[PDB]
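User: We ran a pulldown and think these components assemble together. Before we commit to crystallization trials, I'd like a predicted model of the whole complex to look at. Sequences follow.
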Amino acid sequence: RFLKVKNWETEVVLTDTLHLKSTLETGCTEYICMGSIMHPSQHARRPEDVATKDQLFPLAKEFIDQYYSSIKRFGSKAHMERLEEVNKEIDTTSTYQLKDTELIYGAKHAWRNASRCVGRIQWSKLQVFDARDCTTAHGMFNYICNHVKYATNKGNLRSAITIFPQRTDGKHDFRVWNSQLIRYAGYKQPDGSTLGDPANVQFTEICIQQGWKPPRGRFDVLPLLLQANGNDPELFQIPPELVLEVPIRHPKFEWFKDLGLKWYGLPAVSNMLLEIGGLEFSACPFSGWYMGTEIGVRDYCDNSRYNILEEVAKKMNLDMRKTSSLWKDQALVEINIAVLYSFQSDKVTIVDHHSATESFIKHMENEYRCRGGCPADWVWIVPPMSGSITPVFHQEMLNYRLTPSFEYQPDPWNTHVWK
Amino acid sequence: RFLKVKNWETEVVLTDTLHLKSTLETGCTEYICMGSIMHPRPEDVATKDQLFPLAKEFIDQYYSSIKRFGSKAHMERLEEVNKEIDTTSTYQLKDTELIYGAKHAWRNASRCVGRIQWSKLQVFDARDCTTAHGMFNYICNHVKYATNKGNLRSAITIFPQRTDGKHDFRVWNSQLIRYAGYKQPDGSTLGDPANVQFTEICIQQGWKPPRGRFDVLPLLLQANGNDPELFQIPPELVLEVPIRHPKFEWFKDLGLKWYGLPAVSNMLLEIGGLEFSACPFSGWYMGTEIGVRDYCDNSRYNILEEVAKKMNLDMRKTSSLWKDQALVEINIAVLYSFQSDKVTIVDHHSATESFIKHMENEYRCRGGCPADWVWIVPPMSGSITPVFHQEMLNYRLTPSFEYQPDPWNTHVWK
Ligand code: HEM
Ligand code: HEM
Ligand SMILES: Cc1cc(N)nc(-c2cc(CNCCF)cc(F)c2F)c1
Ligand SMILES: Cc1cc(N)nc(-c2cc(CNCCF)cc(F)c2F)c1
Ligand SMILES: C[C@H](O)[C@H](O)[C@H]1CNc2nc(N)[nH]c(=O)c2N1
Ligand SMILES: C[C@H](O)[C@H](O)[C@H]1CNc2nc(N)[nH]c(=O)c2N1
Ligand SMILES: [Zn+2]
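Assistant: Here's a predicted model for the assembly, 833 residues in total across the polymer chains.
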């Protein structure tokens, strides 16, 4: 029917009708809820490989219909012609091609439909760089460097996506093998320990195994591993002058800078799949700006990551003998005060979790008021520290899957046949 | 057929077969998820034909648990229940069934992070109770036993099940020990703002309030659908802990204390299709419940502003993370204060680790363990506790604990 959500701190109730326009399964049933499973569903809007006409066209009619509906047509001559244009195109090339307006609309709406993104208040202020003309790893690197440079903007970041040619037969995929454009390398020491970023040890080895000359430090910016039209990937080194970086100091603890830490300024996700009207853009790196907790809670403090808590705690003179002292908790706060203070002192865009969550509530308000709802994933919106003292903690959320969408996809090296 | 949950911190993977044995809604549909919705009639008491299959599932479940499935005593107990539902239109749990029932409802409570202790529960059969006075007595002996001079024990007291929905036993208090809250004319709120509507009801039923900040509320007890009655838990039975800080001399001057015994009394215990509308249960506190939620939620005691000030924090801009900083020190103070007075408590780190250990064991020997990530994860410092990175399948087994509407919304006054 129609579903209400309530904020247990304000008693505000919103009514959700947008969920009726949902098409794919979430993973849940009346009997089992999977809202904490990382990839609960494998429901996909098309089959495995190059789809028949009866597969691809209905998806495409839905998106075109949606887009022409967005702009107060539907039934217009332009819309009817467009249906016939896509129809004949699928007939003759087994696919179709997005108008530039179409592609910008879908890119913004995949962001706007991203149930896990706390940052969607900005969704319509996105910069799309069409790169469907691209043919080589080298051209990919030139498109990515311009993305980085525009997005970074001397520290005053801007949102942007760069969209490479869509998928055709699955053996000509365009892939950024990096999970993010800019990440640090992780090295597997001889004594079993791990220097760098432990998450990337497998990628940092494929790079090495591909010819990369590792400087073997802590903050080694990984190369790019770019794959074009199915071919073997190709290492590229982003010019350092394009990788903005913030050294972490603390506004009271002078001993903090001596910890020797820095992070990069540009979060740029590049392993995900953009899906629009049944077309699959397997390479679509997008970028915005960091919520401090992403660096200071997850990046520095997760166990299988930088794990600096003991060392920051020890420098703080903390009772690390039992958990009850909350020594982990205290260091965690100071680290995030340091991350925020460093990005702001270097006028690099960053948002804290209080103002980020606060804004997402305001976004939710807007979306319900004019769109009839807003898909939100409570498990992922709620920041990983101080949850209950942020507004989203006390806000009920409905989760459902709208298209266009961002999607996970397999890591390419599980799939790619070399040559 | 099977389902896998993965721990994204340790790569450990567990195989949930137990979810096949659930038959109650979660609220989620195949195309929409409601995992963050908090809650997705009295004539709605079960009919005879409604009750037969539920009883059969529970009795089978019980005889299975104890290695007696299909046995002579199983088959006779089965027909013995049918005779009762046929004649009396209900039935009566044996004492052993009731203990197994109450222990499994805890075991099956997917939102409770404390279930590793589930099978050491102390069940007090109060089904022979007929009056409010009898309830107050049973409840005092519960409090006294559970508190055990600071070394808390978990315990449940079960009052007579429902009958026709017209003679419910109800503990009107949401918890047995809670502080009062009085709205001032000027808009401000004294005491605990959660309990302000219940404080009004109490006063209207006669309670003479101290009008202080930490008045323990009177019990408001209802038996056999009669009007509820007031009782004062004898102060010598309410253990309390004054909250001081191990580093901040000034902290004790905040004037704060908390009660020592969390005891929830407003939920409904459901075993074999029977509904025990009054079933108070108790364990011990995890620190964050007092430190993060009770003291710091804006709708609760809301002392972050007061603490940060004495801490000299820059409270002009949120990015200073004063809130975050002041919140930790309070939770340090809560944990130090309880431990000093040798009153049981568990911090969110030990608690969550126990639950991961309990979860794996429950997959080992039971085939699963329903959990609610939205509730298991502590309300502060989430991702540094190990349950954050633990995938969790959520489903409703019975016996279960259930919410029920507030008594003053549905009760018709004598
Ligand atoms: C502009 C400021 C932005 C902020 C503050 C922000 C914030 C966040 C955060 C904190 C997460 C959680 C991810 C994690 O903790 O691993 C997330 C997820 C996500 N964001 Fe946003 N984001 C922003 C911009 C964007 C843009 C421009 C896009 C797409 C064009 C986007 C799409 C997504 C998607 C698809 C996810 C899901 C990630 C996944 O499932 O792995 N975000 N965002
Ligand atoms: C023994 C130590 C225990 C600990 C450390 C513990 C901890 C917790 C915590 C922190 C919550 C979250 C409550 C909230 O934030 O509102 C919770 C929920 C819950 N606990 Fe436990 N608990 C314990 C014992 C028990 C016992 C003895 C029972 C029943 C016999 C029980 C049944 C429940 C239920 C049903 C919930 C769900 C609350 C709801 O659905 O609203 N717990 N527990
Ligand atoms: C556009 C954007 C803005 C922002 N503030 N963060 C991210 C962001 C997203 C992810 C994806 N989450 C699962 C991958 F493992 C990982 C990160 F490390 C991020 F930094 C992305
Ligand atoms: C047996 C037990 C142990 C423990 N540690 N906490 C609770 C506990 C449970 C609730 C229920 N939550 C829904 C109402 F909001 C509220 C509290 F205030 C509690 F303290 C109960
Ligand atoms: C709306 C949201 O589900 C709600 O605020 C929940 C989140 N998780 C919770 N978890 C616990 N333990 N207690 C709570 O009250 C809540 N509240
Ligand atoms: C099991 C669980 O889904 C997993 O740990 C999630 C929890 N919530 C998260 N939320 C965000 N924003 N980012 C994450 O990586 C995760 N991890
Ligand atoms: Zn769900």
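Residues A 180, 267, 269, 286-291, 294 surround A1AZ9 (ligand 3) (CB under 6 Å). That may be worth checking against your pulldown data before setting up trials.

User: Thanks, that helps.
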